[PDB]
Design a protein around this nucleic acid. Structure first.
Lengths: 93, 44, 54, 119, 109
RNA sequence: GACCGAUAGUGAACCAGUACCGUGAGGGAAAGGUGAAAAGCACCCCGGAAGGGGAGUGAAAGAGAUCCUGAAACCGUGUGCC
RNA sequence: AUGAGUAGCGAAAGAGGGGUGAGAAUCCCCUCCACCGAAUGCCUAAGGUUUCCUGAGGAAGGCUCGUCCGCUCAGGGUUAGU
């Protein structure tokens, strides 16, 4: 239980994400109940690279007004990993 | 010119909260009354 | 300081007789006359005493 | 008499000073009709002081003409422009260096507008 | 004998009748000059609808614009928006934002 | 069912114990109908757009989006007699 | 509906030249002028909850106008062994 592919959900592709990716940093969306250590091990196992540091952050939901109804979107958790200088680059397509 | 309402989350939860209302039998009566009517917001 | 009775329609219509506005005082220009105001420079071709300033 | 233009005695003076300094630089303005009618007198008085051309004159005008650059690439102060160009331009006329030309009203508040320029 | 309507343009009808009284009955060419030399607020709207009526007469019926005169020039009233404004001591008086329908008919003399 | 038919019948025929009001226990609404079928107005003209005038669909367009019928108070345009 | 196109529009200095635009007293840029300075400066509580950044908008809200906005629609943005 706690397979590593359950921690990572999907990559993040913006201008900021590519700017960071220029410097061997990669941005992911992870499960809302996973701490930095499982993120580190999961990245190590899935891709086979060397990890140096991990930084994590929490996001709240947003209010939307489609039609005459109102609601809220779901929370998010974002992680930024930094590979070492010798490690290969992860082929994020 | 102070008005009568001054917001505070800690006092609100300590006085009108769910965990506070579930202590006496009268609070449980209040919760049952609210459930019977069908209110969306039980306690505060 | 408060009206004693409501006002009918005849009195209202009678009072509104002088609440109106008049036609402007206007005349055309010698060159490309565009029916401008008197003693004023027109904005397209009512060229006041020469060129059309604006 | 004169008109108060809806301002206090100390803002009226400042507004007249600003207008008479801008007219010298730009050679033609557009303001309301009442402002132009109250401005032409002061601007004509200033021109004559310049035409005299002395040190007292220069100093009197200096205590009214705002100090803004009037010509680039020439470091020409507005006072220098007044005492150099206009005096030679109107060296033969005896009064009446201005003319007012009316236009239509304004959209925002219906005020009547006019253009005042140097002739 | 073409016409044109405006149908719920935001302006109080009492203030538009003041100009539509001026314009009624005249000849089409003279009409526009009076309309665009008047300083009120309803003049641009009335001028636009009059131009539309003239264009309708030109294209759909081949009637020519050197003869047209204005025959019917009335103004009606439309639905109302109700707002509020708070007064002293918790009173909240009431405010009305009116609307109007504008109609013009052009005919060959 | 010699019961109601949208101010009636449940507070609620509609995203109702909702929206709003109150620190709280608590109080508590308004709001139904295009057409048999979207066949829901290609194209042209005026306009920045909104909105119109044609042309078309339809048995009906005064049926065109709070779109069955549509009264009264209220607001206007023309005219016969004073 | 009447009162009625009546009362009000909530402490304060702006002027000109450009610009953009269907449209500018009210929006952007420039230059002069004016106001606070034991604050009308900065940092940050409680409380608020996306109001923050960029690109479009001109139905409703701004006590006027509006090409503008703490308004409407789309995308983004918050990194700790001390």
């Amino acid at each position: 239980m706690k397979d590593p592919r359950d921690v990572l959900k999907r990559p993040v592709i913006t201008e900021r994400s590519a700017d960071l990716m220029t410097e061997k940093k990669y941005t992911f969306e992870v499960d809302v109940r996973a701490n930095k250590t499982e993120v580190k091990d999961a990245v190590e196992s899935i891709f086979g690279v060397k990890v140096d540091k991990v930084n994590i952050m929490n996001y709240k939901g947003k209010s939307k007004r489609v039609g005459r109804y109102t609601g809220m979107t779901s929370r998010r958790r974002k992680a930024i990993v930094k590979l070492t200088a010798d490690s290969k680059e992860i082929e994020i397509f | 010119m102070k008005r009568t309402f001054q917001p505070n989350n800690r006092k609100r939860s300590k006085v009108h909260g769910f965990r506070s209302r579930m202590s006496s039998k009268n609070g449980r009566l209040v919760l049952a009354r609210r459930r019977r009517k069908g209110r969306k917001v039980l306690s505060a | 300081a408060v009206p004693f009775r409501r006002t009918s329609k005849m009195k209202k219509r009678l009072r509104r007789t002088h609440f109106k506005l008049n036609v402007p005082g206007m005349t055309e220009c010698p060159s490309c006359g565009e029916m401008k105001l008197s003693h004023r420079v027109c904005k397209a071709c009512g060229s006041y005493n020469g060129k059309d300033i604006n | 008499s004169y008109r108060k233009l809806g301002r206090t005695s100390a803002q009226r003076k400042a507004m007249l000073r600003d207008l008479t300094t801008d007219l010298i630089i730009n050679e033609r303005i557009e303001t309301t009709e009442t402002r132009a009618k109250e401005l032409r007198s002061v601007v004509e008085k200033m021109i004559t002081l310049g035409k005299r051309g002395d040190l007292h004159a220069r100093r009197q005008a200096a205590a009214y003409i705002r100090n803004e650059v009037a010509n680039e690439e020439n470091n020409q102060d507005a006072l220098q422009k007044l005492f150099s160009d206009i005096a030679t331009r109107y060296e033969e006329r005896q009064g009446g260096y201005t003319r007012i030309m009316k236009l239509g009203p304004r959209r925002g508040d219906g005020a009547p507008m006019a253009i005042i320029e140097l002739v | 004998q073409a016409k044109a309507v405006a149908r719920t343009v935001r302006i109080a009808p009492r203030k538009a009748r003041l100009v539509m009284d001026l314009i009624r009955g005249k000849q089409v060419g003279e009409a526009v000059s009076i309309l665009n030399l008047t300083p009120r607020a309803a003049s641009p709207i009335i001028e636009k609808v009059l131009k539309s009526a003239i264009a309708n007469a030109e294209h759909n019926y081949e009637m020519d614009a050197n003869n047209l005169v204005i025959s019917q020039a009335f103004v009606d009233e439309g639905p109302t928006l109700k707002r509020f404004r708070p007064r002293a001591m918790g009173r909240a008086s009431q405010i009305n934002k009116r609307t109007s329908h504008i109609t013009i008919v052009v005919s060959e003399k």
